[PDB]
Design an enzyme around this catalytic site. Structure first.
Site, mmCIF file in Angstrom:
data_model
loop_
_atom_site.group_PDB
_atom_site.id
_atom_site.type_symbol
_atom_site.label_atom_id
_atom_site.label_comp_id
_atom_site.label_asym_id
_atom_site.label_seq_id
_atom_site.Cartn_x
_atom_site.Cartn_y
_atom_site.Cartn_z
ATOM 1 C CD1 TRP A 1 -2.906 1.131 0.202
ATOM 2 C CD2 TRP A 1 -2.662 1.565 2.207
ATOM 3 N NE1 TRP A 1 -3.732 2.137 0.492
ATOM 4 C CE2 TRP A 1 -3.487 2.405 1.731
ATOM 5 C CE3 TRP A 1 -2.275 1.962 3.501
ATOM 6 C CZ2 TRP A 1 -4.329 3.415 2.473
ATOM 7 C CZ3 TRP A 1 -2.942 2.597 4.290
ATOM 8 C CH2 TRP A 1 -4.064 3.460 3.841
ATOM 9 C CG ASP B 1 -2.592 -3.022 6.977
ATOM 10 O OD1 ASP B 1 -3.655 -3.071 7.564
ATOM 11 O OD2 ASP B 1 -2.340 -1.888 6.254
ATOM 12 C CE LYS C 1 -10.998 -0.041 1.360
ATOM 13 N NZ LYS C 1 -10.183 -0.083 0.212
HETATM 14 C C1 LIG Z 1 -3.937 -2.937 2.891
HETATM 15 C C2 LIG Z 1 -4.688 -1.478 3.591
HETATM 16 N N1 LIG Z 1 -4.318 -0.834 4.603
HETATM 17 C C3 LIG Z 1 -4.548 0.171 5.169
HETATM 18 C C4 LIG Z 1 -6.025 0.659 4.520
HETATM 19 C C5 LIG Z 1 -6.706 2.089 4.545
HETATM 20 O O1 LIG Z 1 -7.909 1.714 5.316
HETATM 21 P P1 LIG Z 1 -8.739 2.972 6.090
HETATM 22 O O2 LIG Z 1 -9.842 3.691 4.978
HETATM 23 O O3 LIG Z 1 -9.524 2.383 7.173
HETATM 24 O O4 LIG Z 1 -7.921 3.696 6.834
HETATM 25 C C6 LIG Z 1 -6.362 -0.043 3.200
HETATM 26 C C7 LIG Z 1 -7.431 0.488 2.551
HETATM 27 N N2 LIG Z 1 -7.142 1.621 1.658
HETATM 28 C C8 LIG Z 1 -5.783 -1.312 2.805
HETATM 29 O O5 LIG Z 1 -5.947 -1.781 1.545
#
Ligand SMILES: Cc1ncc(COP(=O)(O)O)c(CN)c1O
Ligand SMILES: O=C([O-])CC(=O)C(=O)O
Lengths: 401, 401
Positions: free
Chosen positions: A133, A214, A250
């Site tokens: 990410w 994560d 999600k």
């Molecule tokens: C691997 C990963 N970690 C962190 C996040 C961030 O999620 P959030 O919108 O809850 O901050 C995401 C979603 N974009 C993700 O896919």
């Protein structure tokens, strides 16, 4: 003659550039495969009915809006840890963990990073999969840690480079931090298999590494919460004392309510109390206390056997619709005459797919066909509909025939 | 061993200590003057009726829960800046500002502090009043700035040390950052009067200091939002390009929804575009994007004439309840036969009040009267009611006569 004359304009946002390039395109057959959230079979946003029902119950209670404790809603913290580790985990039964509510998964990442910066005296290094990410990088840097890489995505196959991954991990200096996506790796969609996990687990325990998980997709990834949380639970049973970032953006559709939790598994309850107090000390100067709305929704769902069950099947339908799109894309790629191996599109898990497409082919998809996507060959499987998958398979074949 | 054997238990939260001890007490005359939020005349939480109306109306619109931009709800940002600056401020008309949504006031302070750390090349020093909100120090410190002080509270009068303040500021090194509470200084309740603010402004402008306003209490302080923001507006009117933290915790009772905003007043729109892009770059690795629910509620109230008019009567209501408590407290001290000067209680503004009481008198108030407060003499006027004010004055007179 001004405070900010030397402040430079930032680089533009590639993912937002594409999302705007799509709104501009006038051709009725255009697809947006850059969108970072779930869409239904019609490409609309989807608010889970269990969420709607939770809101109904909450409103009926006519609750106040007073501050949460620094660590958030106790009952959401307990339910969330429970969702992550399974209700009868040895860890929950002995109390040897602390879970704090956070500003979604990003806030859990940042709180986590800030905690390593302050208390992980053993190393400054955080090892990310190649690639990870995007935001993982500035989160850890802004927090004061050093970033490093280990091999993960094998471009040759569009799947896991198990062996490179392993050589790389064995070479991490002992007592460094290793970041792992618990399932549905982002951006690639490429995850280890259970037997692959056990081996990473082995090195991690052997070489005395710190495993930072994560977990943004429990349940949304495969439809099965226990399966999606399997690696994390397996590391713990192996005796690895993980920490863990959960997101409900999600899997509950709660994106903008920012509902997350950060967890630290500890040797004992007394250690968890010491760690807990220091997380509170880091959190207060970030934002004092986390928001009420999302956490009330998630707590209500998780602690009601009925609602919980109903939400869990609503997740399966999302996970399924995605899987359906993956299988249907390969299908229609065959049906169109394509020759190359497309099994990677269905071996991958979750809503992001590394297609194999190179950048020029990506550009032609944009030019000739109005299919919008990042130059890295990543698509949002959530952009695919039953209504458009056919067209997409046609278009992909054309740039690749 | 363990990853975390060296992690120390952190110190007890003193405010929480006072609040828990209050909750253990079975004295029926007990009072909680440690409380950090508004309470009504029966000591209950208060959800503004305008907030309920705004919520009802949002629910009626069946909205999604999608991600906000990194900078939050555009229309909440606009309305927030108009609230702070007055709708026809030249700052708004030229568009020479940027406003971003933040995790309440604390979140606005942290974002501002990271921006200073990264971009304010002219200083590492932030000057806080003595004393200031306790969280100000760890906020700027975890962000990588250093803290300094200037004389503000005058323990002889329980008032504003105007000449000490003016002298100290006039000797701050040029181009340092100067933090100012916009109104309702926390913890003392002591505010400069308009004339005193003109003089401070004139020294800031003489010494080329950068002025950083924390405004947690517009409208809530005095019941008049125009008067409460006057200093902020006056500074800007004199050519001082301030930054500004806003919270809606107290003035809308949105505490736990976490609704705030950070504004930078700039030379021009062009400079504001640059500053905006770098605030975004700092926000992403913090929490990605802010929570939707409170921002929706606040935007709804601010941009509907009826809801706004109603909300403004509700704020006046709270402010006047606090002013009323202050007045009856002084009045009853006189009826009790106290011979001390207590006008400081009515000269001060907002829901926090430095009483002048010594630690030992605070101890007696806790032990013998079950009146719960911090040892610095600070009381939370929100815990005072028509029911108990007579009792409070009796207790204070008993321990001071
Ligand atoms: C691997 C990963 N970690 C962190 C996040 C961030 O999620 P959030 O919108 O809850 O901050 C995401 C979603 N974009 C993700 O896919
Ligand atoms: O909890 C908070 O956000 C801080 C607060 O009101 C105080 O004690 O003065």
């Amino acid at each position: 003659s001004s405070w900010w004359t030397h402040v430079e304009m930032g680089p533009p946002d590639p993912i937002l550039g594409v999302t705007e390039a799509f709104k501009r395109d006038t051709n009725s057959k255009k697809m947006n495969l850059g969108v970072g959230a779930y869409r239904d079979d019609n490409g609309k946003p989807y608010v889970l009915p269990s969420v709607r029902k939770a809101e109904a119950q909450i409103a009926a209670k006519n609750l106040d809006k007073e501050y949460l404790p620094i660590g958030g809603l106790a009952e959401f913290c307990k339910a969330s840890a429970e969702l992550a580790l399974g209700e009868n985990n040895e860890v929950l039964k002995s109390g040897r963990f602390v879970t704090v509510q956070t500003i979604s998964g990003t806030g859990a990442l940042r709180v986590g990073a800030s905690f390593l910066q302050r208390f992980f005296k053993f190393s400054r290094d955080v090892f990310l999969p190649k690639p990870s990410w995007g935001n993982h990088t500035p989160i850890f840097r802004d927090a004061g840690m050093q970033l490093q890489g280990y091999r993960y995505y094998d471009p040759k196959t569009c799947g896991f480079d198990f062996s490179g991954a392993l050589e790389d991990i064995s070479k991490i200096p002992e007592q460094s931090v290793l970041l792992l996506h618990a399932c549905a790796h982002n951006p690639t969609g490429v995850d280890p298999r259970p037997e692959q996990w056990k081996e990473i687990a082995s090195v991690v325990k052997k070489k005395n590494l710190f495993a930072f998980f994560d977990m943004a997709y429990q349940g949304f990834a495969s439809g099965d919460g226990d399966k999606d949380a399997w690696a994390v639970r397996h590391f713990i049973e192996q005796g690895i004392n993980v920490c863990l970032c959960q997101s409900y953006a999600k899997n509950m559709g709660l994106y903008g309510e920012r509902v997350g939790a950060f967890t630290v598994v500890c040797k004992d309850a007394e250690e968890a109390k010491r760690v807990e107090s220091q997380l509170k000390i880091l959190i207060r100067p970030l934002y004092s206390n986390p928001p009420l709305n999302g956490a009330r929704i998630a707590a209500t769902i998780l602690t009601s056997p009925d609602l919980r069950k109903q939400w869990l099947q609503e997740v399966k339908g999302m996970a399924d619709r995605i899987i359906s799109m993956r299988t249907q894309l390969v299908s229609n790629l065959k049906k169109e005459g394509s020759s190359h191996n497309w099994q990677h599109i269905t071996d991958q898990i979750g809503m992001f797919c590394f297609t194999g497409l190179k950048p020029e082919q990506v550009e032609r998809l944009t030019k000739e066909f109005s299919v919008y996507m990042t130059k890295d060959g990543r698509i949002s499987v959530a952009g695919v509909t039953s209504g458009n998958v056919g067209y997409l398979a046609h278009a992909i074949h054309q740039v690749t025939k």
